[PDB]
Design a binder for this molecule. Structure first.
Ligand SMILES: OC[C@H]1O[C@H](O[C@H]2[C@@H](O)[C@H](O)[C@@H](CO)O[C@@H]2O)[C@@H](O)[C@@H](O)[C@@H]1O
Ligand SMILES: [Ca+2]
Ligand SMILES: [Ca+2]
Ligand SMILES: [Cl-]
Ligand code: NA
Ligand code: NA
Length: 258
């Protein structure tokens, strides 16, 4: 046939072609989240957009290394050092450091999250940008684990609106990865999600992540169509554009026939 038929029942993911100046990396916004609040982050509305109704703490731009690996301090006999969670023991010590005198249950201040000084123990963050596939095919995004709650969304009208990266969050709960902390306990059902992407189109990407206490962990990866995996460092794949709500042609509803 002269032309491709298109994905069935307009099933292609919406993408974008922003015409402005591209910037490397994602924007990270930080919002207040209460220490030891084990319920707010279990609501889909909160993780999709309600986080932005809490106080905005600040932001950092241009971030390409997007995984989270926050370790609380151990105040030890030889000084204060971050403790890998698997090395914590007893009530409590950190392997190779002895007993720790400090509480696992208080807020801690650090620049560990993207250089931004905040409380990684208790915070919500929103990562936004556009994913640029170099290859047409199936991409599988993953979280290796989630501590405490997280979502990943891909696509125009799902992550955010084309050419409108900096706007308040949209209300879609059609997450690509639903890593929301269950009300009962541990292990959302599925922490991978696959998206079919066409090379050279910009796909809106949003990650919302929350920690309520102590350790924070979100190892982000993507499996490319060629079978290789990109983990943590998304340089060359993720970009930002300043809003341009005037760019009439920015939205590509069906990259399968554009
Ligand atoms: O899954 C909840 C929480 O579990 C673990 O935190 C422990 C401790 O560090 C906290 O102070 C108390 C607060 O009541 O909870 C647990 O005993 C960690 O895996 C933590 O990261 C996680 O959020
Ligand atoms: Ca829309
Ligand atoms: Ca935690
Ligand atoms: Cl020890
Ligand atoms: Na860790
Ligand atoms: Na430390």
């Amino acid at each position: 046939g002269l032309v491709p038929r298109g994905s069935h029942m307009s099933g292609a993911t919406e993408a974008c072609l922003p015409a402005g100046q591209r910037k490397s990396g994602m924007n990270i916004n930080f919002y207040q989240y209460s220490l030891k609040d084990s319920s707010t982050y279990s609501n889909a509305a909160y993780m999709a957009y309600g986080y932005a109704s809490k106080t905005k703490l600040g932001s950092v731009g241009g971030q390409t290394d997007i995984s989270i690996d926050y370790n609380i301090p151990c105040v030890s006999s030889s000084g204060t050092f971050p403790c890998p969670q698997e090395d914590s023991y007893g009530n409590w010590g950190c392997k190779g450091m002895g007993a720790c005198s400090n509480s696992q249950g208080i807020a801690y201040w650090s620049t560990d999250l993207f250089g931004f000084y905040t409380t990684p123990t208790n915070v919500t963050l929103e990562m936004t940008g556009y994913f640029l596939p170099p290859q047409t095919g199936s991409y599988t995004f993953s979280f290796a684990t989630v501590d405490d709650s997280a979502i990943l969304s891909v696509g125009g009208s799902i992550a955010f609106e084309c050419c409108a990266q900096e706007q308040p969050p949209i209300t879609s709960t059609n997450f690509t990865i639903n890593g929301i902390k269950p009300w009962d306990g541990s292990l959302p059902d599925n922490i991978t999600g696959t998206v079919y992407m066409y090379a050279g189109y910009y796909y809106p990407l949003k990650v919302v992540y929350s920690n309520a206490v102590s350790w924070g962990t979100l190892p982000i990866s993507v499996e490319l169509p060629d079978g290789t995996t990109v983990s943590d460092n998304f340089e060359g794949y993720v970009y930002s554009f300043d809003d341009d709500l005037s760019q009439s042609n920015c939205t590509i509803p069906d990259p399968s026939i554009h």
